[PDB]
Scaffold this active site. Structure first.
Site, PDB file in Angstrom:
ATOM      1  CE1 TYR A  47       5.252  -3.576 -40.592  1.00  0.00           C
ATOM      2  CE2 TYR A  47       3.086  -4.523 -40.237  1.00  0.00           C
ATOM      3  CZ  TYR A  47       4.455  -4.676 -40.321  1.00  0.00           C
ATOM      4  OH  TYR A  47       4.987  -5.931 -40.185  1.00  0.00           O
ATOM      5  CD  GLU A 171       9.082 -10.595 -42.004  1.00  0.00           C
ATOM      6  OE1 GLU A 171       8.815 -10.885 -43.153  1.00  0.00           O
ATOM      7  OE2 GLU A 171       8.433 -11.012 -41.042  1.00  0.00           O
ATOM      8  CD  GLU A 338       5.980  -9.336 -37.731  1.00  0.00           C
ATOM      9  OE1 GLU A 338       5.602 -10.427 -38.237  1.00  0.00           O
ATOM     10  OE2 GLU A 338       6.501  -8.421 -38.393  1.00  0.00           O
ATOM     11  CD  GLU A 356      -4.400 -19.061 -20.652  1.00  0.00           C
ATOM     12  OE1 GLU A 356      -5.502 -18.819 -21.202  1.00  0.00           O
ATOM     13  OE2 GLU A 356      -4.281 -19.542 -19.514  1.00  0.00           O
ATOM     14  CB  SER A 695      -2.433 -26.814 -19.625  1.00  0.00           C
ATOM     15  OG  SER A 695      -2.788 -25.730 -18.766  1.00  0.00           O
ATOM     16  CE1 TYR A 696      -0.398 -20.881 -16.994  1.00  0.00           C
ATOM     17  CE2 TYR A 696      -1.227 -21.449 -19.160  1.00  0.00           C
ATOM     18  CZ  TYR A 696      -1.269 -20.641 -18.037  1.00  0.00           C
ATOM     19  OH  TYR A 696      -2.235 -19.673 -17.950  1.00  0.00           O
TER      20      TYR A 696
END
Ligand SMILES: O=c1ccc2cc(O[C@@H]3O[C@H](CO)[C@@H](O)[C@H](O)[C@H]3O)c(O)cc2o1
Ligand SMILES: [Ca+2]
Lengths: 703, 706
Positions: A47, A171, A338, A356, A695-696
């Protein structure tokens, strides 16, 4: 086919970090920027607060004359020296927990009453809340633009500077959402009256749509209080249309003023709507920008993603939001203006290990860029913070540029993204399912929302039983879209407004979640879809009314449907699945002539049929199910399997989520474990792996 | 002086598992009971559904004559053979995701309209929601009790049967609460009128309290619609008092009926309140039982805990709820009638790794017994499932009696409890902080709640600014109680009604979260507390009204406080902490007479003071803070430290929660990690340092022999 940002004529994943220079020790500005760059981020976002730089009326400090943290010029110089591009957001509103939402104290103190948003009794709603189209507000907004926009024009990418994008305001309409209150300022109500006259031309035409008895437009009052009559619903419907036009007028005024300075870079806006870590209300907020997105193909909307945690409780929210933004903005990349980094609220924890996983899930779910909000914590300067001294917690960097746990998670994900962006940005999922987005069901921010305390819309009082917010939140967002994602079926969303027939015919199924009302144009579109060879799945109602609750039975009559609405047990049987819980006692009971009955009430009445219409297929269910039992997943699975749609993989553990993304050359398999359980599983196309809780794992295949 | 269950004059941790015979293949009943027993459980728990056993009006099957799973008698016999005691819960409501919440279909078809809970317009709120004191409802309930109660009586412990406890009905008021509407049935209206006539004796006395102008009691009706006048608030306040007498009447009627069968076992009731994994409204629902718990020392209330996950997002709900049960039921053990095991709904996952931590946290937080709900999954027979065929998921056993992941978590926790219960049950936390439970702030279920459709209470219309529901949810439950727990300060909760001065004097500090109203009896008690040497922390308001919003300035006058209410910025400074965000523009501004000013508005006006009064200490803050910023934790920490209250442990990571429980022999240190982070930290007793690694959403328990 994919939309993505470009840098040096190659696909570029936009990695931005939000760093509020006005909230950071200027001695440490270069350190923040270097630590941001060192994660692989390419852009920084901030901003430029009107209150912070117009320190008194017509006294501007952009050079740190009066406080070193007012030195915007030097912060721009530092972004160039540290090879970060810059996103600037000069307002006039910035929100960002800045006192008066970024508007100067001196301005709010001296504006006349008629410059504020007013309630229906003519009282000031909030000492912070102006009327967007107040002549006084726009005069001073323009005087601020006259000082900040020459600085932005000088440093824009079109002049080889670092500023690649600018956000207009912040917004738009967010205050009408959070309060449930419309602006009844006499200038807004005059604009509403122009809109109505423009729309209907004569009072007789309006009277025929509303069933009103006005002798002129002079007897037309702005709607207010609870909807008791179908004429109140009609008035409130056009009041929602009007506010979409109103926001388009406001952003157009800001845009034309900005263009007057020769600022030719990409303009942005940002979509709120996450609450307590889910986003089922965000499509209502997207809907408030329908007229902006129609009229300004040069304004890129991005999402405000605030998951707070990452689990099966909210796994479906980011995908639903990404898919709906793609529906409403198909010509621009899906990006997060955002993108949660740390937490706005000290007591609402944001774990690095949760975020994450969210960042990798966001890649799986089609995100093409994002701005870590907040990359850097801030300290509110002398009494400028609406809440405490500190702005955000558990960020990548604290306000003094100390590395926190999230820093290494962001470096790890950024490293993955830079390695893969050339192939990953050009991949899509293969969707054989299309889900209709009927925007009028979402036009309720003044009458029915999660934030509105007292509901003004009670459909029982209008002789209806299907509430459009219940339908769009529980049957669509938390039901079908959550179910398809859980079952690992790809879906696309399509905006049904002015929708191309040719664009529906790619899909093997189109799913429409229908209330009792639907405009002629959408009823005609769906009629033509099936007649030409399309496979339509429609529930819980064949619509019989238009958006004004006037008779419209085009789809019903085109499809040769007859029904009676009758009360039964909530439970039905459907495709041989017993005890499907449904939302309503009242169900549509269908005449089965030329039809196959496929669903039955407890008393064995036909509450669902299949039939051939011209070259196409119709499946109508006269009952509402979301996803609140295992029978609901079993039903969605049966319905998808009617047109022999297959998952892209067999995965041994049904609670593992996967997304297969591919182009001609490359395939990415994203495996997501939204559960507090170490899972071991194997997979094969339509081979054994361990994923930790929450997790991934990402697998690459060359084709 | 711990309260705990006893078996053979020894401390006994009640470990029960819920096993619904009516949702399990009877050929597998024994296998479920044996596997429960093999976890070290001593008790099994089940509903006896009215709908399941009264198969048609006056057609009863408890022997499996018409369906094998109606063989209640055989299930009771197996419990005895497998050495489990049995909790029975014959309703009439069971809820339990069972069709019509347990009431027979034939009953709900037969009942006339006046059997049903009715809205302000005389419409039926829900086709399975009865009015509790309906003549018809209680007649059929009595006929159901006529058949099921002789079986329960014959199979009691004292007749060498397995039955040790019985629940009366199920979560009185929960269905009304979730419906979002209150009961205006004509029986309620008529009982209300009798209550008001009994309470006020003359219309003149009622008019004097309400400031109304009624000519007779015939002009007054039960209040409906929004509160616009203080007289409407008064009417609704008496309506809330009435509903507590009404629930006492309902449970008294069931109890007197049960006792007539020679049933002498322990009677129970179960407290609802958790929704979406927090329990901030549970204190309102437990408040509806205030008259039951004063009149029935022989009914033990237990909690229905449904955390759904275990994280900082909901860490404070179970402790707050356990502490509030203890406040209202100080002479019985804190226990969980329903203690989450698996999930009632397929879309809301219940992970073994979460619930195992919840079980250990519950021990840290003083639980003395529990019933795993659901230990065993069920399959609904004959379409009896309200919401689907399968009853619960991710339980200890599936419906077939296969062990699921949770079985091993329950065996681990039970093993620890059986090894330690003799000491553990006898341990206390050292609480130097007491928090006041002022029940009338909770008496808003008719006018203001998270579930009520209509907002009937708007305090601004009454010339007030402190909403009691806002105070009790955000300043107390999610504010002070959350902050004390986060900061690892032990607290007790004490019901201020008929409260003994001597029960408050053991604490270093008493914390009162106050609105602008408080009864004379409580204003007096807090006055006497400070004058005799108590240390009071009071915010956000010195009250000046009573429960009927008439003048009561006892506490203000006794503490020698003068104040003006003035508008200012939300931010104040307090004890040198700047930019403390407060909930309201309006603050109490005190003059500095015989006091130390310790908080200031943005205009440097005094909005907090400390003073000595008789032998005691008073700290008043004229502003409202919960826990929505770091500054709030800093402020709570400062106020606690005013009386040199110290944590039991120095812990290197402030985000680790701990509880030290001790008796003469034994110390247990519970560490709880409510965060998704592997945490390595050190600690030491506040009288060398030990290093601990703790997984995300995990726990450690250290035992020391003293
Ligand atoms: O139509 C009905 C009637 C009863 C009914 C009870 C239900 O369960 C209750 O839900 C509360 C909120 O989460 C808990 O506070 C309480 O402990 C539970 O017993 C439920 O889920 C759905 C229901 O629907
Ligand atoms: Ca037909």
């Amino acid at each position: 086919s994919e939309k993505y940002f470009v840098k040096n004529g190659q696909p570029h994943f936009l990695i931005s970090g939000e760093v509020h220079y006005f909230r950071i020790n200027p001695k440490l500005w270069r350190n923040h920027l270097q630590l941001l760059k060192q994660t692989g981020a390419d852009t920084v976002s901030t901003y430029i607060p009107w209150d912070w730089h117009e320190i008194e009326e017509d006294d501007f400090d952009f050079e740190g004359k009066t406080h070193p943290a007012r030195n915007l010029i030097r912060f721009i110089k530092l972004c160039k020296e540290e090879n970060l591009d810059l996103i600037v957001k000069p307002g006039p509103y910035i929100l960002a927990e800045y006192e008066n939402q970024g508007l100067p104290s001196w301005l709010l103190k001296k504006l006349s009453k008629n410059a504020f948003a007013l309630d229906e009794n003519g009282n000031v709603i909030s000492p912070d809340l102006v009327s967007y189209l107040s002549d006084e507000f726009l005069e001073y907004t323009f005087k601020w633009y006259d000082k900040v926009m020459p600085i932005i024009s000088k440093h824009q990418k079109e002049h080889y500077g670092p500023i690649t994008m600018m956000q207009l305001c912040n917004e738009i309409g967010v205050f009408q959402w959070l309060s449930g209150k419309s602006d009844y300022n006499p200038k807004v109500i005059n604009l509403y009256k122009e809109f109505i006259i423009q729309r209907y031309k004569t009072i007789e035409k309006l009277n025929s749509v509303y069933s009103t008895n006005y002798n002129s437009f002079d007897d037309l009052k702005a709607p207010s209080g609870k909807i008791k009559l179908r004429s109140d619903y009609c008035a409130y419907f056009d009041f929602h249309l009007f506010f979409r036009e109103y926001y388009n007028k406001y952003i157009s005024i800001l845009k034309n003023k900005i263009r007057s300075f020769g600022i030719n870079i990409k303009l942005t806006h940002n979509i709120p709507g996450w609450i307590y870590g889910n986003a089922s209300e965000l499509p209502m907020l997207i809907s408030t920008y329908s007229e902006i997105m129609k009229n300004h193909p040069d304004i890129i909307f991005g999402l405000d993603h605030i998951p707070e945690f990452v689990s099966f409780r909210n796994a479906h929210s980011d995908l639903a939001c990404n898919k709906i933004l793609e529906a409403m903005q198909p010509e621009a990349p899906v990006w997060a203006a955002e993108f949660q980094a740390g937490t706005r609220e000290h007591h609402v924890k944001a774990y690095a290990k949760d975020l994450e996983t969210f960042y990798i899930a966001s890649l799986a779910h089609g995100i093409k860029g994002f701005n870590y909000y907040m990359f850097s914590q801030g300290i509110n300067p002398e009494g400028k913070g609406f809440y405490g001294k500190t702005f955000y917690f558990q960020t990548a960097l604290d306000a003094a540029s100390n590395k926190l746990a999230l820093y290494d998670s962001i470096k790890k994900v950024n490293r993955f993204i830079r390695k893969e962006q050339k192939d990953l940005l050009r991949t899509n999922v293969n969707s054989e399912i299309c889900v209709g987005f009927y925007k009028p069901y979402f036009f309720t921010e003044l009458i029915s929302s999660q934030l509105l305390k007292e509901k003004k819309l009670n459909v029982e009082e209008l002789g209806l039983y299907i509430d459009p917010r219940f339908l769009r939140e529980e049957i669509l967002f938390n039901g079908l879209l959550r179910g398809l994602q859980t079952l690992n079926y790809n879906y696309d969303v399509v905006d049904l407004e002015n929708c191309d027939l040719k664009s529906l015919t790619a899909y093997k199924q189109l799913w429409i979640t229908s209330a009792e009302f639907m405009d002629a144009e959408t009823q005609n579109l769906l009629s033509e879809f099936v007649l030409n060879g399309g496979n339509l799945i429609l529930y819980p109602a064949v619509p019989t009314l238009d958006n004004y609750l006037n008779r419209c039975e085009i789809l019903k009559n085109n499809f040769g449907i007859e029904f009676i609405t009758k009360d039964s047990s909530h439970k039905v049987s459907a495709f041989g699945i017993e005890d499907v819980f449904t939302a309503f006692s009242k169900k549509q009971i269908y005449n089965d002539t030329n039809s196959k009955p496929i669903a039955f009430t407890q008393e064995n009445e036909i509450c669902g049929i299949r039939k051939k219409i011209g070259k196409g297929e119709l499946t109508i269910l006269g009952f509402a199910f979301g996803y609140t039992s295992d029978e609901h997943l079993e039903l969605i699975d049966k319905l998808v399997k009617l047109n022999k749609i297959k998952r892209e993989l067999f995965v041994s553990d049904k609670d593992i989520q996967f997304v297969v993304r591919e182009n001609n050359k490359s395939r990415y398999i994203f495996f997501l474990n939204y559960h507090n359980e170490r899972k071991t599983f194997n997979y094969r196309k339509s081979e054994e792996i361990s994923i930790a809780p929450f997790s991934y794992k990402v697998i690459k295949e060359n084709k």
